[PDB]
Amino acid sequence: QIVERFGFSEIMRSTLEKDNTVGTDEALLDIYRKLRPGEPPTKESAQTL
Amino acid sequence: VSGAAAAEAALMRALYDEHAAVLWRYALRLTGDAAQAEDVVQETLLRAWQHPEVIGDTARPARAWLFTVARNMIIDERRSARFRNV
RNA sequence: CUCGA
DNA sequence: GTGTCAGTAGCTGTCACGGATGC
DNA sequence: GCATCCGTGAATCGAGG
């Protein structure tokens, strides 16, 4: 669906390609450990904030 | 044997990684000074290591005990020793 | 902080 | 002596330049 | 071997609150 919305730009395709991790529960924890480092990452503890 | 004297540490380093970085923020909001918070955190967790009757019941909230320990120490610093100089 | 050459 | 959730404010509205720092 | 990012610098004196 992301490729569906931003497909008209090569820059967004290249972003999704050069991406590191894929998955709804993966990038979530990737954000959690950069925003509030040093804490155990729960799926719901990140889904909440 | 020696594995037990090592188990002590491996038990403390396991509560650190889950409660220290969170306790810090509490004393932070209450003191507005990350330095004193850094101090209070270590004081608290040292007492914790000194009071094993709290972590032994793993199934009970330990963080909840920690917060009160800290909250008390901060006001102990807001004692007469603070009123005059701060 | 506000201001003068 | 302490024990159920118990979790910053603030903030990027400067810039040119050189060289160690780092992928 | 080279781009990033760190650290350095950025007029003078003066008044009052």
Curated annotation (Swiss-Prot), chain A:
Transmembrane segments: none annotated. DNA-dependent RNA polymerase catalyzes the transcription of DNA into RNA using the four ribonucleoside triphosphates as substrates. The gene is rpoB. This is DNA-directed RNA polymerase subunit beta. The RNAP catalytic core consists of 2 alpha, 1 beta, 1 beta' and 1 omega subunit. When a sigma factor is associated with the core the holoenzyme is formed, which can initiate transcription. Belongs to the RNA polymerase beta chain family.
